[PDB]
Amino acid sequence: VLGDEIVSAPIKYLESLPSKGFREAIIDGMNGWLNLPARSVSIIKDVVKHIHTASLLPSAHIIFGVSQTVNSTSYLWTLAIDRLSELSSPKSLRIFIDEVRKMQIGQSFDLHWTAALQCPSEEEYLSMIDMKTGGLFHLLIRLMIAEMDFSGLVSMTGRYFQIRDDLSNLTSLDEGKYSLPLIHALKHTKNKVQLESLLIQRKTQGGMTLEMKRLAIQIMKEAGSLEHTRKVVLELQDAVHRELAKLEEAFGQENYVIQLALERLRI
């Protein structure tokens, strides 16, 4: 008899590291608007956690290797679908599979843009982040509804989260991911050749050094990208706050925890 002690080790490792439960907060804040049993909420939380963990997969692949990490990712997919199988709604499978399909397509495009050293436009990047990030958000929304319109709020929340994380990473690069400040700088700078060469050498050497990071940040600063993205974040935050109010006026109630979660992520 062989048990699930080896395949579940990376899963039990990355599911114990602390994290800010923004998705957990949204789950705990939306069941107030439409009432659901505690078991359904727990099932939805488990499914969302499994999907996010599988998206993530020191790093777990450093401790456990690559092949074991891939096997554990497949096991995570199986666990998530098994947990989803217990829901009462009969259309949960279609929602799950199509949202996961969208997330996977967005992730593939995000990987390909970085690998091929081709910079996307702002519109293409926004569409990609919409897919990749809001797939989980409106999977959550659809699963909760099945067991008003939420597309605009989901899109604004995903964009706000992503570009706010971009500012938190830069203002406060070594992976080569094309963020919004990098996209803006690559089209509004005089040292375009220098920035392109920096990206090419980062790809070649496998990473960037501290001096290269300082030079790239300086080139970004002289282009004014770090202010344009801050203005974008301010606009997105205002859009999210105004989108939440339109939903609050239709249900005849105010969510005092979703607003608290948003205030915990203020600018």
- Which positions lie near its own copies, rule CB under 8 A? 1-7, 9, 13, 54, 58, 62-68, 70-75, 77-78, 81-82, 85, 93-94, 97, 100-101, 104-109, 111-112, 115-118, 124, 127-128, 131, 191, 193-194, 196-198, 200-201, 203-204, 209, 211-212, 215
What is the rounded distance in angstroms from the CA atom of residue 260 to the CA atom of residue 141?
19
Instruction: Compute φ and ψ for 88, nearest 5 degrees.
Output: -75, -30
Distance set, CA 80 to CA 91, 200, 238 (Å)? 16, 39, 35
The whole-angstrom separation of Cα 49 and Cα 21 is 10
CA distance 76 to 7: 10
CB of 84 to its own copies, least distance (A): 9
Query: Are 255 and 29 in contact, with CB atoms under 8 Å apart?
Result: yes
Q: Residues near 71 by Cβ (< 8 Å), separated by ≥ 6?
A: 7
Which position has the token pair 């205002």?
A: 238
Task: Identify the residue whose tokens are 């599911």.
Answer: 15
With beta carbons less than 8 A apart as the criterion, state whether 144 and 135 touch.
no
- Indicate the residue among 106 and 158 with the shorter CB distance to its own copies: 106
Is 177 flagged in the annotation as binding? yes
Question: Based on CB atoms, which residue is closest to its own copies, 35 or 67?
Answer: 67
CA 163 to chain centre: 10
| Minimum distance, C-beta of residue 120 to its own copies, in the bound complex (Å) | 10
Task: Name which of 214 and 246 has its Cβ closer to its own copies.
Answer: 214
By C-beta, is 90 or 252 nearer to its own copies? 90
Query: Computed over its alpha carbons, how large is the radius of gyration of the chain?
Result: 20
95 and 143 in contact (C-beta within 8 Å)?
Answer: yes
Name which of 28 and 124 has its Cβ closer to its own copies: 124
Tell the smallest beta-carbon distance from residue 26 to its own copies (Å): 24
Which residues define the annotated binding site for isopentenyl diphosphate?
A: 20, 23, 52
Which residues define the annotated binding site for dimethylallyl diphosphate?
A: 132-133, 162, 169, 177
